């Protein structure tokens, strides 16, 4: 039963292939032994004295009184709760940016996360750690040691000692029942319901020539989309985005999903990754066949940031120089946010110019839209989203009971809160400590 | 690796300077010469002995 090694893990030893190896190879041993002179031990044990009439419970109450004077003991408890919430919120945020690492629920799994390297999970864990060091401004470094090995994808703590007979005592220390991790799972689950409030958008992107003169609403498209991947006579571009140029008098053809060269003028489903490595072949060949009303592409970004450019419908506007800028800033690095052009809704019935528009989304992304004119009698020309009463049921709804909402679907701007009025005492303000 | 590694982008950006170097079409031209320079040298010393 000689305790040979007392060991502390930083990494869960079962997700790496290490379930059968010994404890001295999975966990990290402590290695400290400060030397003691026995001659100082023998003297100090064999000739210690005290006061004569020493009542020792009096002597300790005299001595231990200025160590329980305030919150000396109760700072480690406040530090321990933050090191539990920031540990789960680092374990959740690392294992949600990977394909199923931990049982952790994944509500925004639909957003694309390509990079799952340990270098990428080290930047996620470090910025979660920098958020808890900024919000709570705790100066001592919390969880700035689970990234000592390199990966926080397998961040799970465990401590174990090992006697000489192999009788290893090994008990884990799992994090307790969190509370911010429960709250961060409701911000995420609501985020998918309305990401348009944070300027993100669902659905894809359509580039068809639409020479409209009346109302145009790119974020909220009426009726169905022109086509969807896998429809009739709809082709998906191959992963290179290459174009085989045909000779004297024929037309150049895209290379579709597969190896077959299909001709450009028709319909196309451009995935977002192909457009990041073929923009110089997009803007030279297929994009003139978009402008001339021949082909229609579907730049199927999964989710994207958008950017609205409002304009006056009295004056003409071609949306092609705003799209040609957007196709120019596309690298293999990343795309700029999608530029939609929505007309400013006019109060009076006007004579609108014939304008050429291209980019309009597929799924309805016009959620973060408040009434078009909130200080006019009626919106004549443009879209007239009045102040929608669904976000305000605490104000206009008659059969609204105080205490309810609809949290994983919408946001309710007018609710009934509790406003606490606590008083925070010191330890001297509760008991008498003298 | 780097902190943002796309394995298809990294290899395509690094192999395209290699296929500009036409060493694949030099090493075939040095082979057909050393075929013709072998048989005209093998028989040139096997006609003497």
């Amino acid at each position: 039963d000689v305790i040979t090694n007392v060991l502390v893990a930083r990494v869960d030893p079962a997700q790496r292939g290490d379930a059968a190896v010994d404890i001295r190879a999975t966990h990290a041993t402590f290695a400290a032994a400060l030397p003691v002179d026995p001659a100082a031990i023998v003297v100090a044990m064999l000739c210690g004295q005290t006061e004569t009439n020493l009542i020792p419970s009096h002597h300790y109450g005299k001595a231990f009184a200025p160590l329980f004077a305030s919150n000396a003991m109760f700072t480690r408890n406040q530090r321990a709760v933050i090191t539990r919430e920031a540990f789960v919120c680092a374990r959740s945020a690392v294992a949600q940016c990977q394909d199923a690492g931990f049982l952790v629920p994944r509500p925004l799994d639909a957003l694309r996360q390509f990079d799952v390297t340990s270098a990428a999970a080290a930047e996620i864990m470090h910025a979660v750690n920098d958020a808890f060091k900024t919000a709570f401004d705790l100066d001592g470094a919390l969880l700035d040691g689970l990234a000592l090995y390199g990966d926080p994808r397998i961040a799970d703590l465990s401590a174990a000692y090992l006697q000489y007979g192999g009788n290893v005592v090994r008990e884990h220390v799992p994090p307790g029942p969190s509370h911010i991790h429960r709250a961060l799972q409701q911000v995420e689950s609501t985020f998918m319901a309305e990401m348009n409030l944070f300027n993100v958008a669902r659905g894809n992107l359509y580039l068809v020539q639409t020479a409209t003169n009346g109302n145009w609403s790119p974020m909220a498209p009426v009726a169905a989309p022109p086509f969807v991947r896998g429809g009739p006579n709809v082709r998906v571009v191959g992963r290179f985005g290459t174009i085989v140029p045909r000779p004297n008098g024929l037309e150049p053809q895209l290379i579709d999903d597969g190896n077959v060269p299909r001709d450009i003028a028709g319909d196309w489903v451009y995935p977002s990754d192909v457009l990041q490595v073929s923009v110089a072949v997009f803007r030279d060949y297929v994009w003139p066949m978009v402008k001339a009303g021949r082909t229609r592409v579907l730049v199927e970004l999964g989710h994207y940031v958008y950017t609205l450019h409002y304009y006056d419908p009295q004056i003409s506007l071609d949306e092609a120089p705003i799209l040609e800028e957007w196709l120019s800033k596309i690298n293999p690095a990343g795309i700029p946010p999608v530029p939609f052009c929505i007309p400013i809704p006019q109060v009076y019935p006007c004579i609108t110019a014939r304008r050429v528009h291209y980019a309009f989304t597929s799924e309805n992304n016009n959620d973060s839209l408040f009434s078009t004119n909130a200080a006019s009698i009626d919106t004549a020309f443009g879209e007239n989203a009045a102040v929608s009463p669904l976000r305000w049921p605490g104000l206009v709804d008659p059969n609204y009971r105080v205490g309810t909402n609809d949290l994983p679907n919408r946001i309710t701007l007018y609710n009934s809160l509790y406003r606490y009025n606590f008083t925070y005492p010191t330890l001297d303000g509760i008991m008498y400590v003298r | 690796t780097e902190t943002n590694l796309i394995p298809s982008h990294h290899y395509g950006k690094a192999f395209a300077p290699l296929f500009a170097s036409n060493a694949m079409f030099t090493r075939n031209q040095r082979a057909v010469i050393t075929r013709e320079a072998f048989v005209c040298a093998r028989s040139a010393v096997a006609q003497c002995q």
Binding site: G241, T242, Q276, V277, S278, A280, V281, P332 | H9, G12, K13, A16, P17, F19, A20, S21, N22, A23, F25, T26, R27, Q29, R30, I33
Partner: peptide, 30 residues
């Protein structure tokens, strides 16, 4: 030497073509 340019498409820059010995193509065509 049989290759002149290889104009890339992702970045659109032109990649031109150039005890041992640097091997060269034997002068076949005369």
């Amino acid at each position: 030497n049989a290759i002149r340019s290889f104009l890339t498409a992702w970045d659109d820059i032109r990649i031109l073509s150039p005890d041992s010995a640097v091997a060269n193509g034997p002068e076949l065509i005369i």
